Amino acid sequence: RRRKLPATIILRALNYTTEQILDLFFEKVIFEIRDNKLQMELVPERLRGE
Amino acid sequence: EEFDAIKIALASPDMIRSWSFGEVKKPETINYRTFKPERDGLFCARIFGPVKDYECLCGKYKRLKHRGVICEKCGVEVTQTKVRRERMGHIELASPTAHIWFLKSLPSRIGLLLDMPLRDIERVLYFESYVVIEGGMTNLERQQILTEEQYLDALEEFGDEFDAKMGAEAIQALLKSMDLEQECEQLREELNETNSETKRKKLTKRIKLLEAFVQSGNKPEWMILTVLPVLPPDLRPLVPLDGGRFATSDLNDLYRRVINRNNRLKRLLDLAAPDIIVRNEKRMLQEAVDALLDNGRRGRAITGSNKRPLKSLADMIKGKQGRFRQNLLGKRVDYSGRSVITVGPYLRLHQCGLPKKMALELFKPFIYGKLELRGLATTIKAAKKMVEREEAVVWDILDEVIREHPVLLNRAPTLHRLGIQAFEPVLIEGKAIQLHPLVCAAYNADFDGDQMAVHVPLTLEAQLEARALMMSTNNILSPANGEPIIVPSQDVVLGLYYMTRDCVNAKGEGMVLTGPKEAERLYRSGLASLHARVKVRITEYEKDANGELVAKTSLKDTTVGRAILWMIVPKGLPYSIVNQALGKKAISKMLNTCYRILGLKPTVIFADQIMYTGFAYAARSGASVGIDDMVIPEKKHEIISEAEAEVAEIQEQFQSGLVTAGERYNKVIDIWAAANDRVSKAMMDNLQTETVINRDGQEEKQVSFNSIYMMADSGARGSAAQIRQLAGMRGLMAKPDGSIIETPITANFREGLNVLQYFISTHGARKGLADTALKTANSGYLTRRLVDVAQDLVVTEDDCGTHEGIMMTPVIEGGDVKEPLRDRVLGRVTAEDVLKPGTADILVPRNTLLHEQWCDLLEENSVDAVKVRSVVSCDTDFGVCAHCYGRDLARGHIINKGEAIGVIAAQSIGEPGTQLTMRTFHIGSSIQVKNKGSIKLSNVKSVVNSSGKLVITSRNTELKLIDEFGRTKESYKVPYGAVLAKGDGEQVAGGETVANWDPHTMPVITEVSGFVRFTDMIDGQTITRQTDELTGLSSLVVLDSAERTAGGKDLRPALKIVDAQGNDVLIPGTDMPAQYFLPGKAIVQLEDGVQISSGDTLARIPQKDITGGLPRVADLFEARRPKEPAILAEISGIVSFGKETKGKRRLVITPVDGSDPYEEMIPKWRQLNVFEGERVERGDVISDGPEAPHDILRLRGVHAVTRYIVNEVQDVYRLQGVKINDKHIEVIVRQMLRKATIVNAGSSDFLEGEQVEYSRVKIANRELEANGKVGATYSRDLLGITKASLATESFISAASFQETTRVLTEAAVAGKRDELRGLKENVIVGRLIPAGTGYAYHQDRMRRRAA
Amino acid sequence: SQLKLLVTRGKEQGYLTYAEVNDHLPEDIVDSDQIEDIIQMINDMGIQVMEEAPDADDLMLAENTADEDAAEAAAQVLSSVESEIGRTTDPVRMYMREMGTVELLTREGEIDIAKRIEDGINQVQCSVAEYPEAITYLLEQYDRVEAEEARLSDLITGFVDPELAREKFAELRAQYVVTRDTIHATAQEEILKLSEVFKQFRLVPKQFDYLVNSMRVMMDRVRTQERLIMKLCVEQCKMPKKNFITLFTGNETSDTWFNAAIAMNKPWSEKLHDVSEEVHRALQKLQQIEEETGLTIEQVKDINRRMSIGEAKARRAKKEMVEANLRLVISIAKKYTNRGLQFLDLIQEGNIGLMKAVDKFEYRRGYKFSTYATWWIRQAITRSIADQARTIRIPVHMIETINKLNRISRQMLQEMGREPTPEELAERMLMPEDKIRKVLKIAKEPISMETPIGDDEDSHLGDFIEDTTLELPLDSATTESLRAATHDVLAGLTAREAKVLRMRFGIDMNTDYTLEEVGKQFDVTRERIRQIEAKALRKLRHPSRSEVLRSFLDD
Ligand SMILES: [Mg+2]
Ligand SMILES: [Zn+2]
Ligand SMILES: [Zn+2]
């Protein structure tokens, strides 16, 4: 029951760096520039109610 | 031994030797072979006296004549053995040692006495760090601590003219070397020069402290013990238990430890060990003594051979087991007993039954006296053998001792002062205390095995008090309201409600009777039923003449039932009281009218006659319950099918995506509760009028005799809810989370309950249990906390002699009048005379006890407000005058002189508190007059618009409803500028709307009618491009601060009103020209280019839960400021804005001319309900929300805050439907707002910003301004009870309920010569209480003193 | 500062938690004793929790105490404890930390420490042989002892048979008398012979303390006389240090350097005139001390100075060694941590024992001082744990018997299988079969009279031990009734009858008399008394006169 800490500290101490932390706790949304101004990938489920 | 005030102070060492009887020296206690005490250890013979009465230790001297001579062989003063209980011996602590209380009390006594922080004191004590003690004048400050190496160098620095120690020797040197008059002069100096309010604040505080510590008889070094007294031998015994095992107290252990360590330190000193050794030893002795005193504040107790920390001297005084709370208030009591109570209806209400055997065990001394009086046993031993044989004649002698000897009967928790009533006895076979039946409502005692205890009053004053004050038939009026507490409860009312009803065609229909007497002669012989409607010739005695009783025969049209009830009703009552159904409410107001008309004797004898006849005809009814009695509605299956189809609708619509899950859940629960109410109504209408029977004709329907319906109608038990659960379905069990389950119980108790449904019932059932388990274990916390604050308060003057009371009127919360005036001016005594509306008169003198005759007059003349004298403005010094408390009591006359009203007040507020939900609990745009009656407007500021309608330009115009009587029949609170229709004081018609306004949006309607333009409205800076742009509505609405520039914040959004040319007409009365300025979000619609009409919405400005538990009352009396404090005016004058938005925008209000500059900082996240151009009255609603009672008290005045508290807590009760008269809350408030503050002392001698209590400062300036001198301004305070009880003139009192240690130590340093004359004080020290009968005795001692 | 944020949150929120406080606390202390102190302070502060669980309902609902003037001091104690340093708590840890500043080895540096100790004892030994009253005290003790007023083996604790000692007493007697019988031709040779004949003897430490105390009293006399000289000359006459020590040094015997100094035509000489007699008395006591001893006061000072310096060296060596061996004491004392006594009490007993070990060590048997003092430490702590541990104190042999019984009880309770009976202990042990009953009756502790007998509302064993010696109110009423009855009975006699029958008993008077005093009253210490007493006894034996008395018979 000692002091609090940033909970990511245990994950970094588990031989995890930031990239694989983010890719453990998140899905992905890509952004591209295909000949014009920042195209986007779009799965239909992503953008519900926004 | 009628001594005096008790006195407390420091324990000077030579005083501690005068207490001594010889130094304890050795740790032995007893001798392990002969269990005499070794000399001399914690125990002794020569120190603390002899073991056996009048017998030496070695045994040389063993006769009463030799008392006093100390045996030459073992020096034991041959005297009594109770002298073993009063002798204190001392210890000669080799090195000194610091008393833990004057070290770790919290605010260190030594800390703020030496002007030194605590950590350095712990340094010098535990040898962390050296410290100077009068280091002379070379380099070092007096308090200047050091460390090891620094002292080592400084010895080379100043080996001479230098003085540095460490240990208790150091603190003692400092305290002794201190000179207090020097520090008083120095502190008065820096009070002179150092002109910094914080600085000279703490400066003058410490000088207050030192002058106090000087004006005691104390000395500063007495806080550091050199000599430490041992408790005697017999307060910490070493009892020989059976088997050689001894069961000693713990102080023997602690003193053994301390004596060991003292001897060991002396032994170390003789050798002169290296300094690590002696230092660790002195630390060990310090910890030992500090564990002796408190065994806490040191960090970790020193537990004995158990794992349980061993108790110590600061712990045999403290706690709910210390001597204060556990053996000075709760003490066992000889001459008592107990048993299982029982029913016993054959008793008048002034005699409790009682067993022969409890009687012959309680009254043995009385029996013995009588038996040596009648010569049935020459000596007392013979009388004992007799009454222990249970012979023939001791029963006769016991009946001669139990003739008029009232036993006190108590129940387990004695909440309210009817909890302890006396009775006479009536000797009885058995072992159940056959209690009376009526009194059980008062005790709150069913007969499920509850055990009442009987005491016995020994003396003769106590017998006259157990007869003239505590007899059963002198407490029938509940102390918390005048209504009798002898309400007939369950079998008696069912008996009457069966007796006085009427079935349509019983025997003996319509036949006339010659009176009540042959009504009984018909019923008993059987010629006619108990109830069948019948003409009789009653003869009621109305007593309208002055005390007369004018007979008047007649032929009332009644039943036989009512008539046979009439033979028991006494004279003065009128026959229309027993001609009705006689439910429970009516059968109790029967007794109420009896007490209000005929006094007390006929009401007592009449309550007994009612119980007798009630039981008799309740038994004759055979009012049984059977399983054909609970009729199910035959229209139940349809209703359940219909609702279970509506849930099909919502299920289909949920799986069409039309409603969320929350919505379908709410709708389901809504249609089930609707089906529930419909099924319950259907059963109740199949149940009430169900019986259909037939008088000599076709048919006819009447109220039914379904046994469960009479049991639900009378008020005997239950109601329509329990009748619901027995016949209709039973609702929706609510799971203990608070969320209500959605699967209702479509079955009931006459049908079964399959497994799921019963189980779902289990949730709410066990929540009810788990709360009424915590309520019975924490039931009296509120009464406890109130009698702590409101206890020493005693009605100790006949007439305070004032003219200042609080104005009483009937409460009206925007509707039907909640509480009329005859329930509020019933008992209280008028303040200023009352004038009939033409003044016509002098209706009532100012000192008339308003009993019901005067309420008769006041209600015959339609008086609206009666400025009645009140407890919170009585002008008495340490008391409350006779009149101003009023009259209310278990009796009906004026309150006697002395009768301790603080306690019965706290109990009037605390015994119904059992009858309230313990969890807190939340209940949750046009005006419509009810009926005929004129309109009445207060604070109305209206304008005669060119439109015609009426609009109020005052923030606080109350819309009342007056009739041609003049009474206030209704009142409503108009918002600002509501569109008003009818006249101001004129007439309207019933049920007709008269006021409409804007629900959410605030009009800014103009003052007079003149041309319009704009000023300082630049878009982007002060205004924005708003418009209902489909309509053309150019709206350049005022910009807020986050959208106005940083110079825009310096801009003034405005609405100028031009006259016919371009100038600005003066505002009528004032000289501010015609225009309105506006804040942010002052949404503008129209623009420059129109002449306004009065009632022009120049802008559009947008925008209750009543906790009802007991904790709402706890927090009301605690007076905690709420979360959102109602911001409130401060100076009666014009309003304005301040330094714009420094996080919290600053208001500014200004009077006509006086001290204007008041600006207030407000969290601008909250609405400001004030105009930008108005004159806010002092004590006016700038904002909304609950307003803090402190602000009421400081802005408005006393009577405002007292009416606030009483109406708030009265809301909390009469929500639940509990009656409690307002004397009690007003007296608890008078104990709340007791302290005071000062503004300008002036011709008195109190510190300006000091807090002193009202009585003291008021007598001070009353006697001074009585002289030629000038008074002293005081700003009244208002403390919560938990803090307003926290200050007490006595310390013996405050050593009970406060934490004992702080009380004792503060009084100790202050040398506070505590008088007696409280009630905690005298109940502790065991002399006469100065409250009730003891008051004349204390007046006796007052006369003795001061002469 | 953040702990002050804990303070403000405890103020607002109305409580805290172990997690909250453990969050805000100042890092790096975590002893859990400072923690318990600070938690008690936050309790004593406005916050009144300390919590675990957040709430809390109608069960003791809406509680609070203002407690003004405690918050400002408690928050102050917090902000001061955090900012400055982390303070130590308790006293065992005090002792640990305070002795941890001891350089914890003397690997054969004990030899140098004992060297310093021998230096001190030998310098003070030269003081011994040189102090005249030492030898006079020895000779006086010898005479007192020989007559039989004291023992020879009580005075001196052996040299390096009391007749050997006695002939040596006569040898040193002749040495001292020949030293004294030459009053300045061979005085140094005389003192040499005396010292070299007395410097292989020895005495009891308390006899040496008596020697040193007469020596200290000699020093106190000389210091009081030097006060009478200098505090009456310098500090009474403005006769400063230089102008006083010009004549106060070197010879320091004659009255001349004061009286003739009065005549040296100086201000101090013009102020010493009324202190002349007082300093004359001072130098007269000084020369009477001279008369006493034989050596100048300056030799007095030099001798006591050498003694004091040797004593200081020896005490300092003792201190240094004990500071070293405190670790040994702690290690050896850890082994009794539940004997019925405190850890610190054990280690303090060990301190005393280690001091005695230091005082009774010698390298002249080749010991290793660590293991040497281990025995003394364990013995002293054993003596203490026996003597002052039990509540009611049992003696040492009794504690030895008790631990014998416990050892044999353990041996039998796994030899015989179940457990032994007293009849079996009285044959494994060889006690009289009844001492074992008394021993195993006695050797048990007492029960704590605040023991929680929790079988009730909330009670204690102390609240259930009734009082046995109180007289019943029935008894007191019977006593008063019997007094009244017998008084009326005795009134139902004659004056002489009643007087004799009160006196020969203790009725309505002090303790009861003898026939000697009965006769000293009624003139006849003879059968008149017997006649009256027995005849009145017969008269009151009359039924119809003592029926009520015999009704007072509890048979
Ligand atoms: Mg019950
Ligand atoms: Zn004696
Ligand atoms: Zn009054």
Strand pairing report for B341-342 and B433-434: parallel
| Residue B71 labelled as part of a binding site | yes
| Å from CA of B445 to ligand 1 middle | 6
B766: CB partners within 8 A, 6+ apart: B736
* Rounded alpha-carbon distances, angstroms, from residue C403 to B633, B988, C397, C400, C426: 86, 106, 10, 5, 15
Burial-class residue C549 by CB neighbours within 10 Å (0-12, 13-18, 19+). middle
Q: What are phi and psi of B802, to 5 degrees?
A: -135, 180
| Residue C149 labelled as part of a binding site | no
Q: Does B117 touch chain C (CB under 8 A)?
A: yes
| Residue B800 labelled as part of a binding site | yes
**Distance from C-alpha of B614 to C-alpha of B623, rounded to nearest angstrom:** 13
Task: Name the residue in chain A with its Cα closest to that of C21.
Answer: A3
Q: Own/partner pairs for C253-261, CB < 8 Å, 24+ apart?
A: C253/C283, C253/C286, C253/C287, C253/C290, C253/C296, C253/C297, C254/C283, C255/C280, C255/C283, C255/C284, C258/C229, C258/C233, C258/C283
Residues in chain A within 8 Å Cβ distance of C27:
3
| CB burial string B1013-1050: b at 16+ within 10 A, e below | bbebbeeebbbbebeeeeeeeebbbbbbeeebeeebee
**Distance from C-alpha of B934 to C-alpha of B990, rounded to nearest angstrom:** 10
Asked if C22's CB is within 8 angstroms of A2's CB, the reply is: yes
Q: How many CA within 13 A on the CB side of residue C520? A: 7
Q: What is the DSSP letter of B1098?
A: -
Give the per-residue SS3 of B132-166: ECCCCCCCCCCCCECCHHHHHHHHHHCCCCCCEEC
Outline where B1267-1329 has alpha helix (H).
Answer: 1281-1284, 1300-1310, 1320-1325
**Distance from C-alpha of C200 to C-alpha of C219, rounded to nearest angstrom:** 26
Place of tokens 């030269």: C126
**Distance from C-alpha of B1126 to C-alpha of B1183, rounded to nearest angstrom:** 6
Give the per-residue SS3 of B1109-1127: CCHHHHHHHHCCCCCCCCC
**Distance from C-alpha of B254 to C-alpha of B1037, rounded to nearest angstrom:** 81
**Distance from C-alpha of B829 to C-alpha of B881, rounded to nearest angstrom:** 12
Is the Cβ–Cβ distance between B1126 and B1288 less than 8 Å? Answer: no
Is the Cβ–Cβ distance between B810 and B825 less than 8 Å? Answer: no
Report whether the peptide linkage leading into residue B808 is cis, meaning its omega lies within 30 degrees of zero.
no
Amino acid of residue B228: L
Is the Cβ–Cβ distance between B965 and B858 less than 8 Å? Answer: no
Closest CA of chain C from A42, distance in Å? 43
Q: Which ligand is nearest to the CA of B876?
A: 3
Neighbours of chain B (3+ CB pairs under 8 A): C
Q: What is the DSSP letter of B326?
A: I
**Distance from C-alpha of B751 to C-alpha of B636, rounded to nearest angstrom:** 12
| Residue C547 labelled as part of a binding site | yes
- Reduced to 3 states (helix: H, G, I; strand: E, B; else coil), residue B239 is coil
Is the Cβ–Cβ distance between C339 and C389 less than 8 Å? Answer: yes
Is the Cβ–Cβ distance between B1220 and B909 less than 8 Å? Answer: yes
Task: Name the residue in chain C with its Cα closest to that of A1.
Answer: C19
Chain B residues 77-116 with CB within 8 Å of chain C:
81, 106-108, 111-112
The angle, 0 to 180 degrees and rounded to 10, between the axes of the packed helices C162-180 and C132-147 is 140
Angle at B849 between CA B845 and CA B853, to 5 degrees: 90
Burial-class residue B952 by CB neighbours within 10 Å (0-12, 13-18, 19+). buried
Q: How would you list the strands of the sheet with B934-938, edge to edge?
A: B934-938, B958-962, B968-973
* Rounded alpha-carbon distances, angstroms, from residue B1169 to B99, B750, B956, B1126, B1156: 59, 58, 12, 10, 21
Q: Which residues pair with B91 in a beta bridge?
A: B228
Closest CA of chain C from B197, distance in Å? 17
Helix (H) or strand (E) holding A39: strand A39-40
Amino acid of residue B1161: M
Q: What are phi and psi of B223, to 5 degrees?
A: -75, -10
Six-digit token pair at C54? Answer: 């957040």
Residues in chain A within 8 Å Cβ distance of C18:
1
- Reduced to 3 states (helix: H, G, I; strand: E, B; else coil), residue B121 is helix
Residues in chain C within 8 Å Cβ distance of A3:
22-23, 25, 27
Q: Does B60 touch chain C (CB under 8 A)?
A: no
Task: Name the residue in chain C with its Cα closest to that of A5.
Answer: C23
| Residue B56 labelled as part of a binding site | yes
Is the Cβ–Cβ distance between B57 and B45 less than 8 Å? Answer: yes
Amino acid of residue B1077: F
Is the Cβ–Cβ distance between B540 and B547 less than 8 Å? Answer: no
Q: How many CA within 13 A on the CB side of residue B10? A: 22
| Å from CA of B451 to ligand 1 middle | 9
Closest CA of chain C from B276, distance in Å? 7
Angle at B1207 between CA B1205 and CA B1209, to 5 degrees: 65
Q: What are phi and psi of C33, to 5 degrees?
A: -100, -45
Strand pairing report for B351-355 and B420-428: parallel
Amino acid of residue C177: V
Nearest alpha carbon to residue B106 among C48, C25, C45, C8: C45
Amino acid of residue B1231: Q
- Say what the resolution is, in angstroms: 3.7
**Distance from C-alpha of B445 to C-alpha of B519, rounded to nearest angstrom:** 37
Q: Which residue among B245, B378, B919 places its CB closest to the CB of C447?
A: B245
Strand pairing report for C447-448 and B407-410: unpaired
Helix (H) or strand (E) holding C537: helix C527-541
Six-digit token pair at C309? Answer: 């310096």
Asked if C18's CB is within 8 angstroms of A2's CB, the reply is: no
Nearest alpha carbon to residue C230 among C218, C216, C242, C214: C242
Q: Own/partner pairs for C453-458, CB < 8 Å, 24+ apart?
A: C458/B321
Helix (H) or strand (E) holding B677: helix B661-687
Helices and strands: H and E segment counts in chain A = 2, 2
The CA radius of gyration of chain C, in Å to the nearest whole number, is 40
**Distance from C-alpha of B405 to C-alpha of B466, rounded to nearest angstrom:** 9
Six-digit token pair at C195? Answer: 């010292």
Technique used by the depositors: cryo-EM
The angle, 0 to 180 degrees and rounded to 10, between the axes of the packed helices C205-237 and C110-130 is 70
Strand pairing report for B247-248 and C447-448: parallel
Six-digit token pair at B1035? Answer: 């709206």
Closest CA of chain A from C23, distance in Å? 4
Nearest alpha carbon to residue B1009 among B1052, B947, B1053, B1071: B947
Is the Cβ–Cβ distance between C61 and C36 less than 8 Å? Answer: no
Q: Which ligand is nearest to the CA of B73?
A: 2
Outline where B993-1138 has alpha helix (H).
Answer: 1111-1118
Residue B340, Cβ neighbours under 10 Å: how many?
A: 14
The angle, 0 to 180 degrees and rounded to 10, between the axes of the packed helices C297-333 and C343-359 is 140
Is the Cβ–Cβ distance between B840 and B826 less than 8 Å? Answer: no
Give the per-residue SS3 of B337-403: CCCCEECCCCCCCCEEEEEHHHHHHHCHHHHHHHHHHCCCCCCHHHHHHHHHHCCHHHHHHHHHHCC
| Å from CA of B883 to ligand 3 middle | 6
* Rounded alpha-carbon distances, angstroms, from residue C238 to C32, C227, C243, C255, C261: 63, 15, 10, 19, 13
C–B touching, 3+ CB–CB pairs within 8 Å = yes
| Residue B884 labelled as part of a binding site | yes
Asked if C452's CB is within 8 angstroms of B279's CB, the reply is: no
| Å from CA of B341 to ligand 1 middle | 10
Q: How many CA within 13 A on the CB side of residue C525? A: 8
Place of tokens 């009103």: B1057
* Rounded alpha-carbon distances, angstroms, from residue C264 to C233, C267, C270: 14, 9, 9
Q: Does C52 touch chain A (CB under 8 A)?
A: no
| Å from CA of B47 to ligand 2 middle | 13
Residue B544, Cβ neighbours under 10 Å: how many?
A: 7
Is the Cβ–Cβ distance between B1097 and B1004 less than 8 Å? Answer: yes
DSSP per-residue codes, B838-872: T--S--B-TT-B--HHHHHHHHHTT---EEE--GG
**Distance from C-alpha of B969 to C-alpha of B966, rounded to nearest angstrom:** 9
Outline where B363-503 has alpha helix (H).
Answer: 364-373, 380-389, 392-401, 440-443, 461-468, 491-499
Is the Cβ–Cβ distance between C64 and B1121 less than 8 Å? Answer: no
| CB burial string B912-930: b at 16+ within 10 A, e below | bbbebbbebbeeeeebebe
Q: What is the DSSP letter of C520?
A: H
**Distance from C-alpha of B799 to C-alpha of C515, rounded to nearest angstrom:** 77
Neighbours of chain A (3+ CB pairs under 8 A): C
**Distance from C-alpha of B212 to C-alpha of B180, rounded to nearest angstrom:** 11
- Reduced to 3 states (helix: H, G, I; strand: E, B; else coil), residue B558 is strand
Helix (H) or strand (E) holding B1055: strand B1054-1056
**Distance from C-alpha of C449 to C-alpha of B246, rounded to nearest angstrom:** 9
Helix (H) or strand (E) holding B227: strand B224-230
Nearest alpha carbon to residue B1039 among B1056, B1012, B1019: B1019
Residues in chain B within 8 Å Cβ distance of C443:
none
Residues in chain C within 8 Å Cβ distance of A4:
19, 23
Strand pairing report for B224-230 and B164-165: unpaired
Q: Which residue among C91, C447, C452 places its CB closest to the CB of B283?
A: C91
Place of tokens 């400021």: B1121
Residue B1064, Cβ neighbours under 10 Å: how many?
A: 17
Q: How many CA within 13 A on the CB side of residue B1115? A: 19
Q: Does C367 touch chain A (CB under 8 A)?
A: no
* Helix, strand, coil percentages for chain A (3-state, nearest 5): 20, 10, 70
| Å from CA of B870 to ligand 3 middle | 6
The CA radius of gyration of chain A, in Å to the nearest whole number, is 17
Residues in chain B within 8 Å Cβ distance of C478:
379-381
| Å from CA of B200 to ligand 2 middle | 66
Give the per-residue SS3 of C291-305: HHHCCCHHHHHHHHH
DSSP per-residue codes, C327-357: HHHHHHHGGGTTSSS-HHHHHHHHHHHHHHH
Q: How would you list the strands of the sheet with B1175-1176, edge to edge?
A: B1159-1163, B1144-1150, B1133-1137, B1175-1176
| Å from CA of B1226 to ligand 3 middle | 12
Six-digit token pair at B392? Answer: 């023939």
B727: CB partners within 8 A, 6+ apart: B630, B631, B632, B633, B683, B687, B748, B750
Dihedral sign from CA coordinates of B853, B857, B862, B864: negative
Q: Does C32 touch chain A (CB under 8 A)?
A: no
Dihedral sign from CA coordinates of B406, B407, B411, B414: positive
Six-digit token pair at B444? Answer: 């709150």
B334: CB partners within 8 A, 6+ apart: none
Place of tokens 């203002």: C66
Helices and strands: H and E segment counts in chain C = 25, 1
DSSP strands (E only) in B1264-1343: 1274-1276
Residue B160, Cβ neighbours under 10 Å: how many?
A: 7
A–B touching, 3+ CB–CB pairs within 8 Å = no
Residue C330, Cβ neighbours under 10 Å: how many?
A: 18
Strand pairing report for B993-996 and B979-980: antiparallel
Report whether the peptide linkage leading into residue B40 is cis, meaning its omega lies within 30 degrees of zero.
yes
**Distance from C-alpha of B978 to C-alpha of B998, rounded to nearest angstrom:** 7
Q: How many CA within 13 A on the CB side of residue B1280? A: 19
**Distance from C-alpha of B43 to C-alpha of B238, rounded to nearest angstrom:** 9
Burial-class residue C128 by CB neighbours within 10 Å (0-12, 13-18, 19+). buried
**Distance from C-alpha of B495 to C-alpha of B488, rounded to nearest angstrom:** 10
**Distance from C-alpha of C346 to C-alpha of C336, rounded to nearest angstrom:** 8
Is the Cβ–Cβ distance between B617 and B499 less than 8 Å? Answer: yes
Closest CA of chain A from C31, distance in Å? 13
